[PDB]
């Protein structure tokens, strides 16, 4: 489906998951089809050029729903800095999903234009010995496009990242469990009822993506060894690159979202401690 993202306050930008992944798979077929032979190598600049020429145009197609989007930030900023508004949210949210569903034929064409490019380069991939096909392009590409990312994930503890997040998600829940007592009034009780619900849905997407990230970081690390200092027959080589491309694309899309969804969660926890400034200053007077 789709994924809504509030990285900074006053910033909103969506990601159609099957789309981002479809694009990435064809980017890896483009590079591996180029990096195979030593001669093709120089093509990279034109491929580099093309990816930009296709990405920029997708961003234009998505930026054509800016108004419906800018109407959403308005309905979002209103609930963050305070049924009527609760139902104002769902109608505007359901309006944005329709805008993407409207530009469906618009999106699927940029999608096919890149599939028509990437496969064209893949069809063009020749072998000198189809019996004994080289795997330099696999090693070069991985070591230059995918490896940094494996290190990048192996460095940051994505588990503590969730561990720290439930600890936060817990106290706010402990706060709302005993605030509901006979206190339910003016502490913008609905804002704490909205963000906690909003933050809980964010964590579920993070926990969903981190599993996929931790998943594919094993799969990719295991699968390279099998296809690196050797020479397959074309029939296998053709397949072997696609599998690595299929597995790269997931890792990458699902990773991109884990960083976006991380940032989106803390800008949604900025508006909790700020709306907690109220609750402390409130309760500080009662002892007088």
């Amino acid at each position, epitope marked *: 489906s789709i994924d809504i993202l509030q990285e900074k306050e006053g910033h909103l930008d969506f990601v159609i998951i099957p789309h981002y992944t479809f694009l990435d798979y064809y980017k890896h077929l483009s590079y591996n089809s180029i990096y195979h032979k*030593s001669s093709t190598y120089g093509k990279y600049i034109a491929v580099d050029a093309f990816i930009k020429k296709i990405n920029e145009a997708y961003d234009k197609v998505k930026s054509k729903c800016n108004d419906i989007k800018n109407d959403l930030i308005a309905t979002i900023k209103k609930l963050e800095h305070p049924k009527k508004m609760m139902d104002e949210y769902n109608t505007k949210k359901k309006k944005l999903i329709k805008c993407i569903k409207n530009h469906e034929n618009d999106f699927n064409k940029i999608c096919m234009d890149m599939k028509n490019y990437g496969t064209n380069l893949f069809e063009q991939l*020749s072998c000198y*010995n189809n019996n004994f096909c*080289n795997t*330099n392009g696999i090693r070069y590409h991985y070591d230059e496009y995918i490896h940094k990312l494996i290190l990048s994930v192996k460095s940051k503890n994505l588990n503590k990242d969730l561990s720290d997040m439930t600890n936060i998600l817990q106290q706010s829940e402990l706060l709302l469990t005993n605030l509901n007592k006979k206190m339910g009034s003016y502490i913008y009780i609905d804002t704490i009822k909205f963000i906690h619900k909003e933050m809980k849905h964010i964590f579920n997407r993070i926990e969903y993506h981190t599993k996929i990230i931790n998943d594919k970081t094993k799969i990719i690390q295991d699968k390279i060894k099998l296809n690196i200092w050797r020479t397959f027959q074309k029939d296998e080589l053709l397949k072997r690159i696609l599998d690595m491309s299929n597995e790269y694309s997931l890792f990458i899309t699902s990773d991109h979202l884990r960083q976006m969804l991380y940032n989106t969660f803390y800008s949604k926890e900025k508006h909790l401690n700020n709306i907690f400034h109220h609750l402390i200053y409130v309760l500080q007077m009662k002892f007088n």
Partner: antibody, heavy 120, light 112 residues
Framework: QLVESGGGLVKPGGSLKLSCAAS????????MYWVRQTPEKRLEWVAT????????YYPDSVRGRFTISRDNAKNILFLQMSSLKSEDTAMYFC???????????????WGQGTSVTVSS | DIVLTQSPASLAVSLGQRATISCRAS??????????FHWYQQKPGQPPKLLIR???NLESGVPARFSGSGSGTDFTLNIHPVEEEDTATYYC?????????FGGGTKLEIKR
């Protein structure tokens, strides 16, 4: 077209460098070969070099005795000959691989040849 | 190491008749998709010139009379009608394995 130079008379145990001047085409797109033709007309494959020098193949007959190299900048093919036997006496041809999409193409263009002769 | 056996070694042929050269390989040089084999022509005092590309993949400049055939281990180069511009040593080659092997040779000969 291709042109072989560097042949002549070497005593057994000696060394010799053979060059090939590639023209009419984009040298660094093609895999390159060396083929000898003995006086009794037998064709014996000598060496294969990839477009960007990364892959090199030699028959067990010439293993570690001969060295194939290219200078894609100067558009030249080189066969180093070291510690030669009389057995190497032959017409040394340099040749372009076909560069077929589906397959392991033939020796499409063949140079004129250079005579090597290993006799004391 | 693959070995390519050409039958015959020499061949006597009257002008206009049929000429048949057969190459036999130790290992199969084919795949249900490709056939890494090739025929050349070697006119006296000249380098071998590429005659047939794969099985029958004739060359841009090779007449209608020439026709190479086969798959796997057994191949056949057919020349009909034979003319004077045909007297040459014929060599079959393989591009299948690491040891790229050539054939023995087949000297065509016009019977007068």
């Amino acid at each position: 077209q291709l042109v072989e130079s560097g042949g002549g008379l070497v005593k057994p145990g000696g060394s010799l460098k053979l060059s090939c001047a590639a023209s009419g085409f984009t040298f660094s797109d093609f895999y390159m070969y060396w083929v000898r033709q003995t006086p009794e007309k037998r064709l014996e494959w000598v060496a294969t070099i990839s477009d960007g020098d990364s892959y090199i193949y030699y028959p067990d007959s010439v293993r570690g005795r001969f060295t194939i190299s290219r200078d894609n900048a100067k558009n030249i093919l080189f066969l180093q000959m070291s510690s030669l036997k009389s057995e190497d006496t032959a017409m040394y041809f340099c040749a372009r691989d076909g560069n077929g999409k589906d397959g392991g193409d033939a020796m499409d263009y063949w140079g004129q040849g250079t005579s090597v002769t290993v006799s004391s | 190491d693959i070995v390519l056996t050409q039958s015959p070694a020499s061949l006597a042929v009257s002008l206009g008749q049929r000429a048949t050269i057969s190459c036999r390989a130790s290992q199969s040089v084919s795949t249900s998709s490709y056939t890494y084999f090739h025929w050349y022509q070697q006119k006296p005092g000249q380098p071998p010139k590429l005659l047939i590309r794969y099985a029958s993949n004739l060359e841009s400049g090779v007449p209608a009379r020439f026709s190479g055939s086969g798959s796997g281990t057994d191949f056949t180069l057919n020349i009909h009608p034979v003319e004077e511009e045909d007297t040459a040593t014929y060599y079959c080659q393989h591009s299948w394995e690491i040891p790229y092997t050539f054939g023995g040779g087949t000297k065509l000969e016009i019977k007068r």
